[PDB]
Nucleic acid binder design. Sequence first.
RNA 1: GCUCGCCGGAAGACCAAGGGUUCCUGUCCAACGUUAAUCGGGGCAGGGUGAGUCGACCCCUAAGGCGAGGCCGAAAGGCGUAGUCGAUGGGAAACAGGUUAAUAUUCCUGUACUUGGUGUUACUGCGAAGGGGGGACGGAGAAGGCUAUGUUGGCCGGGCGACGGUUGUCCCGGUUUAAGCGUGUAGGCUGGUUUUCCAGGCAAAUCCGGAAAAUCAAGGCUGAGGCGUGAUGACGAGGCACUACGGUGCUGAAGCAACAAAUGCCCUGCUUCCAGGAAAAGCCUCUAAGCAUCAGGUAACAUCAAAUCGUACCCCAAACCGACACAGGUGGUCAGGUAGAGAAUACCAAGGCGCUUGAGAGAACUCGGGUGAAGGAACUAGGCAAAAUGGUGCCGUAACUUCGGGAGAAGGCACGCUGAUAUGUAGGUGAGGUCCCUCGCGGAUGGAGCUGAAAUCAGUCGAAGAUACCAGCUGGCUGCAACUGUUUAUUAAAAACACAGCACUGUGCAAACACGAAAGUGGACGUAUACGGUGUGACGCCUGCCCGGUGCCGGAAGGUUAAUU
RNA 2: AGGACCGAACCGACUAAUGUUGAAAAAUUAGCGGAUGACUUGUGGCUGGGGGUGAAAGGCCAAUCAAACCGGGAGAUAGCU
Lengths: 88, 45, 271
Amino acid sequence: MIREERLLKVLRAPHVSEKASTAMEKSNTIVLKVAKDATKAEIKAAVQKLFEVEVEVVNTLVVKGKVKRHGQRIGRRSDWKKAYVTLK
Amino acid sequence: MKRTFQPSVLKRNRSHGFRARMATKNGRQVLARRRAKGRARLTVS
Amino acid sequence: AVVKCKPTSPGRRHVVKVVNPELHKGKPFAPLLEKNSKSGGRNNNGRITTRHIGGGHKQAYRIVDFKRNKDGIPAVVERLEYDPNRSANIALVLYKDGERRYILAPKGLKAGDQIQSGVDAAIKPGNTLPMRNIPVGSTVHNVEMKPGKGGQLARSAGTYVQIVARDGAYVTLRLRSGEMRKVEADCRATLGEVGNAEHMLRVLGKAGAARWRGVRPTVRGTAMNPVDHPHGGGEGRNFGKHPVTPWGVQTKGKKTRSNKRTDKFIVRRRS
RNA sequence: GCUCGCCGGAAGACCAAGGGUUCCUGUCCAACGUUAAUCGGGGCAGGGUGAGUCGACCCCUAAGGCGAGGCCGAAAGGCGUAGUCGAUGGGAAACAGGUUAAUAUUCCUGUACUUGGUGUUACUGCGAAGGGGGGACGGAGAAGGCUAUGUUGGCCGGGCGACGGUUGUCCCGGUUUAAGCGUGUAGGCUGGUUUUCCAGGCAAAUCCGGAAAAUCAAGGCUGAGGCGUGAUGACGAGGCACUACGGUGCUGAAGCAACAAAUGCCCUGCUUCCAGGAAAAGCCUCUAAGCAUCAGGUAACAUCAAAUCGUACCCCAAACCGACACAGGUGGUCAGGUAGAGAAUACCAAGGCGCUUGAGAGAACUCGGGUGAAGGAACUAGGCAAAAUGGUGCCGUAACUUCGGGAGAAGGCACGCUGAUAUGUAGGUGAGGUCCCUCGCGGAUGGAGCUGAAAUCAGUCGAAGAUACCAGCUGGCUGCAACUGUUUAUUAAAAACACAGCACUGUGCAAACACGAAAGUGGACGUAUACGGUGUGACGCCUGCCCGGUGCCGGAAGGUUAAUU
RNA sequence: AGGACCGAACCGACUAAUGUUGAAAAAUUAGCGGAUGACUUGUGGCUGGGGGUGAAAGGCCAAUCAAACCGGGAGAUAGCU
Ligand SMILES: [K+]
Ligand SMILES: [K+]
Ligand SMILES: [K+]
Ligand SMILES: [K+]
Ligand SMILES: [K+]
Ligand SMILES: [K+]
Ligand SMILES: [K+]
Ligand SMILES: [K+]
Ligand SMILES: [K+]
Ligand SMILES: [K+]
Ligand SMILES: [K+]
Ligand SMILES: [K+]
Ligand SMILES: [K+]
Ligand SMILES: [K+]
Ligand SMILES: [K+]
Ligand SMILES: [K+]
Ligand SMILES: [K+]
Ligand SMILES: [K+]
Ligand SMILES: [Mg+2]
Ligand SMILES: [Mg+2]
Ligand SMILES: [Mg+2]
Ligand SMILES: [Mg+2]
Ligand SMILES: [Mg+2]
Ligand SMILES: [Mg+2]
Ligand SMILES: [Mg+2]
Ligand SMILES: [Mg+2]
Ligand SMILES: [Mg+2]
Ligand SMILES: [Mg+2]
Ligand SMILES: [Mg+2]
Ligand SMILES: [Mg+2]
Ligand SMILES: [Mg+2]
Ligand SMILES: [Mg+2]
Ligand SMILES: [Mg+2]
Ligand SMILES: [Mg+2]
Ligand SMILES: [Mg+2]
Ligand SMILES: [Mg+2]
Ligand SMILES: [Mg+2]
Ligand SMILES: [Mg+2]
Ligand SMILES: [Mg+2]
Ligand SMILES: [Mg+2]
Ligand SMILES: [Mg+2]
Ligand SMILES: [Mg+2]
Ligand SMILES: [Mg+2]
Ligand SMILES: [Mg+2]
Ligand SMILES: [Mg+2]
Ligand SMILES: [Mg+2]
Ligand SMILES: [Mg+2]
Ligand SMILES: [Mg+2]
Ligand SMILES: [Mg+2]
Ligand SMILES: [Mg+2]
Ligand SMILES: [Mg+2]
Ligand SMILES: [Mg+2]
Ligand SMILES: [Mg+2]
Ligand SMILES: [Mg+2]
Ligand SMILES: [Mg+2]
Ligand SMILES: [Mg+2]
Ligand SMILES: [Mg+2]
Ligand SMILES: [Mg+2]
Ligand SMILES: [Mg+2]
Ligand SMILES: [Mg+2]
Ligand SMILES: [Mg+2]
Ligand SMILES: [Mg+2]
Ligand SMILES: [Mg+2]
Ligand SMILES: [Mg+2]
Ligand SMILES: [Mg+2]
Ligand SMILES: [Mg+2]
Ligand SMILES: [Mg+2]
Ligand SMILES: [Mg+2]
Ligand SMILES: [Mg+2]
Ligand SMILES: [Mg+2]
Ligand SMILES: [Mg+2]
Ligand SMILES: [Mg+2]
Ligand SMILES: [Mg+2]
Ligand SMILES: [Mg+2]
Ligand SMILES: [Mg+2]
Ligand SMILES: [Mg+2]
Ligand SMILES: [Mg+2]
């Protein structure tokens, strides 16, 4: 069992996009931004506890952050983890 | 024509990487010199 | 058997092969194999320490019984085999207790021949005895230099030692070099000559045949520049110095033995 | 959008390496783009990478690295044992179809599979860091059986033709379907079983090895493909509804056979040769200490688990290495048609491109090409360059030779198309059918159909039939080097280096010798038929005289002679 | 069978022309040699500077080689310009 304190940190935000919207309507799959170190088991437990739904499966990927400019200055956005959470 | 730089990340890291530098006294002196100069990148790592 | 190749190509014209139909066509006895990876004549500093070594065919090491210490138990020769690691052939022998070993194949040994080691063994080719139990004038091979150490002398194809004399603790041996040498009489020896005496009649025939045996080309010192070799240099073919090694030591007659420890055992130098 | 051209063993497709957002969408055109740019690999913003099965990680080792102790070394350190790392190698498992603007063996649909935990039930000797087996291995060659794949016919749908003809021996298109599961075939390997015993496998072993009997002679292992099922499904030419004119949505025929056929598969095989061809784990099996009505093992069933990281995109290139959007460099995989021996070459398919300045003009001269009267090497240092030869079959072929060669010597003849032999032959393939029949993936016998050279004879067109592309110039004398190789990356490829062969010489093994203050290590797990050094350089005939000089080897009377005393 | 033969890939680099502020700090085009081997190639490893490695050209050791490169002695010294 994963502690509620952990579960309350792993889900960061719903990911809003055309693919996310399509994933919701066509495959009953919510797309979430999750903690970089979140495992599939933690994401599953967090969604089931906090959103009060039944998760079939979690698929995850790491989005590499884009290199960007802000004047004569190179920055990099952070890498972040995306979860495709298929609901029952 | 074949030029001199034929990149391999494995060879790069084994030849010049942080752990290769740390493995010898003289490599550690490289790191000490680069820290003393205040290099942003100590090694190819 | 010594077979001349027909000159169907220039690299074959001079080839003389030693073809032995008795040798096992199939694979060696796997429990007595070990890997033997190549050095290129380089030591643990990674430096070439013996020149002219490199490449050639991959070779598994056959564990050969040079000690021949399994006394009293008869063994039958199962088969003769090619050994890439040495000039001699080897014999897979089966002891009566089910143990198999490789031995150097003596001249005349064949599948079915019985061999035995020990003080009480018959004076027959392939039998191993302490040299105190071998008649003076006997031809032997695989001769130990220290008791129990394993044979070190007369192991190459066609080689053998003559026990010329027995004087108390020691036997005097005539080696293939012509050297007369004392060894302890407790040192073992195998009766007979090492087989495959035709080995020396082979003619490689081509450069590549030496390359297959892991011999890289020898470059003559006189073909080099002075920086590389004492013999190097000259406008045209020049020499004009005493022949030396690459390291400057005279290489035509200068004696290099310096072993005061072992001088006592040398009755007469090969000379 | 239509047309044209170019690549097509690539200039297509998929990757590794490397790069790192270059991917997709919207928007912008300052700069970047060798021009303009509405376009872009450019700017800006947003989106996009979904895995028990692919890869990494992981287990396992190679070379090699590191290395507790250790040995060695002024110090730094060096080497190395136990170990522990290290892939480029060994080790579980997923396929087809559908889908996004952009991912997909990852999502969806369908159908699978693997390993491990836990529980239940039945039954049971389990137990390793130890033993044995296995994993587990070379080159070449040959042939058979196959498949991928192609071709043709059949089938199904459509067509009836911009200009003579075209209801046909006519035209166009399609004719696809996996893993898995079941079956066990062409082929390959091996005698099988039981009992008894045992100086071997560090101890033990019921395993392996060995020995001895008896019995049976046919059991086992391995194995492509095929077939069945998977699939009453999916896909499907096209058609019909909608069209944001980008595409969505719906529906759906046939879906067979024959022949040809790989470099792929059977095959880690077979045959053969010498240069004699990793390791370790997973796996199988054996026991030891130990544990015993327990653990543990085996099987079935249920259940749970299989994390993490990579996944976009380029990848013979405008994204990598070359300062460039650079005629350069870069490993693997895939391999359609016609002709062809072919992965050559020509033309095409799928697919991809026209190379990021154009427009004119039609001078000299330069570059890259075409043709050339008469002559034909007169050119020139030199036939440099060019021209030429060029295929297959057959005929024929000198000196010399180490008897292999020389040789494709030289030189010559035939070659297209049509018809006939023969409505398509020799040969290959092989159905129905009929027999036998262990009884099927089976013979045997048939020869339907299919495919199909080569030849001869006769005819016939052209100047020319190896018509294009493609594709040896040949001969004579002679120097050098035997030969195949190697070399001055970037002005020298040679007669230089190497070479097999030869000789001299050292070297008795703790070898000589080499690397190393040393320990050690190479030499070599070799042992004088071996190893090092040197010179010579296949082979043939040979290799003369000189030991005074300088080396080397041996000697040691005498002379001289160090530290020391 | 073969360091066998002809010939693509692949590996080379004999000749010529071009190019020489190049398309390219060594190439392109037409020819040319090897093409089962002393072959070739990927990945990784080892050898280190009076050192390596070298079928030997003083070749090669990161466009550098009769002693690499980088930093230091260092403002070497320069009866020379
Ligand atoms: K041998
Ligand atoms: K030589
Ligand atoms: K010389
Ligand atoms: K050198
Ligand atoms: K010379
Ligand atoms: K010279
Ligand atoms: K313009
Ligand atoms: K995985
Ligand atoms: K991992
Ligand atoms: K018409
Ligand atoms: K499968
Ligand atoms: K099937
Ligand atoms: K992907
Ligand atoms: K790649
Ligand atoms: K000549
Ligand atoms: K040449
Ligand atoms: K003399
Ligand atoms: K130096
Ligand atoms: Mg899933
Ligand atoms: Mg993932
Ligand atoms: Mg040598
Ligand atoms: Mg030699
Ligand atoms: Mg020279
Ligand atoms: Mg010198
Ligand atoms: Mg001279
Ligand atoms: Mg002279
Ligand atoms: Mg960008
Ligand atoms: Mg784009
Ligand atoms: Mg512009
Ligand atoms: Mg403008
Ligand atoms: Mg852009
Ligand atoms: Mg896998
Ligand atoms: Mg060490
Ligand atoms: Mg220590
Ligand atoms: Mg190790
Ligand atoms: Mg490991
Ligand atoms: Mg690997
Ligand atoms: Mg894509
Ligand atoms: Mg093979
Ligand atoms: Mg087929
Ligand atoms: Mg019809
Ligand atoms: Mg008409
Ligand atoms: Mg092939
Ligand atoms: Mg992709
Ligand atoms: Mg361009
Ligand atoms: Mg380019
Ligand atoms: Mg290439
Ligand atoms: Mg083709
Ligand atoms: Mg082509
Ligand atoms: Mg003109
Ligand atoms: Mg012309
Ligand atoms: Mg003319
Ligand atoms: Mg004319
Ligand atoms: Mg004329
Ligand atoms: Mg003429
Ligand atoms: Mg003339
Ligand atoms: Mg003239
Ligand atoms: Mg003239
Ligand atoms: Mg010419
Ligand atoms: Mg020409
Ligand atoms: Mg002359
Ligand atoms: Mg030559
Ligand atoms: Mg040559
Ligand atoms: Mg040059
Ligand atoms: Mg040249
Ligand atoms: Mg030693
Ligand atoms: Mg010579
Ligand atoms: Mg050849
Ligand atoms: Mg070269
Ligand atoms: Mg060329
Ligand atoms: Mg040739
Ligand atoms: Mg050729
Ligand atoms: Mg010179
Ligand atoms: Mg250089
Ligand atoms: Mg110097
Ligand atoms: Mg000073
Ligand atoms: Mg100065």
